[PDB]
């Protein structure tokens, strides 16, 4: 039935699939349309789902599953599509360099603008009139 995975950064995947299988911390689970309302946390694992025309590849980190007979959703703090947990950690590590570079650039732009403003104000002040 309808499935969707979302993250605090935003939605990731959205489609209607009649078979989804996930690994919960207490054991394996499998969901089909008309399933009873069930809540279970998910550890670091794939989100193997079948009937999307072909076996679709979704992997999540810090997952949390909530199921409705007509709606399926899982909440993940991080998600990717290669299903290789090494790829997930690789992406997480690679994002750190981008974050540092972005923070440094944001700081330097403001510093340059502030220097320009300081010089202009100093010129205005020394022109006391």
């Amino acid at each position: 039935i309808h499935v969707s995975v979302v993250t605090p950064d935003g939605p990731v995947y959205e489609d209607d699939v009649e078979m989804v299988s996930v690994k919960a911390k207490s054991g394996e689970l499998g969901i089909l349309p008309g399933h009873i309302p069930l809540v279970a946390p998910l550890e670091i694992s794939a989100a193997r789902l079948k009937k999307g025309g072909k076996t679709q590849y979704i992997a999540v980190s810090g997952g949390f599953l909530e199921v409705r007979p007509d709606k399926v959703t899982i909440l993940a703090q991080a998600a990717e599509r290669a299903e290789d947990i090494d790829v997930l950690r690789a992406k997480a590590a690679k994002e750190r360099a981008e974050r540092r570079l972005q923070s440094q650039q944001d700081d330097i732009d403001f510093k340059r603008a502030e220097l320009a403003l300081k010089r202009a104000m100093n010129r205005l002040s020394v022109a006391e009139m």
Binding site: T7, A127, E128
Partner: protein, 56 residues
């Protein structure tokens, strides 16, 4: 005061005004981007909130 001093002060004030206007434009663009980022967070927050509400 002297005419030249007043002219110099006017030029300096014009420069400061230009710098402040540029800063304002940059801040406006960043505010728009921040609003988009904030609105991108709603679907996760509402869902987790309702799940916590009906479970706890």
């Amino acid at each position: 005061a002297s005419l030249r001093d007043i002219k110099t002060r006017i030029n300096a004030t014009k420069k400061t005004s230009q710098i402040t206007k540029a800063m304002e434009m940059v801040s406006t663009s960043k505010l728009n981007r921040a609003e988009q980022n904030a609105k991108s967070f709603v679907p996760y927050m509402e869902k987790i909130q309702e799940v916590v509400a009906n479970v706890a």
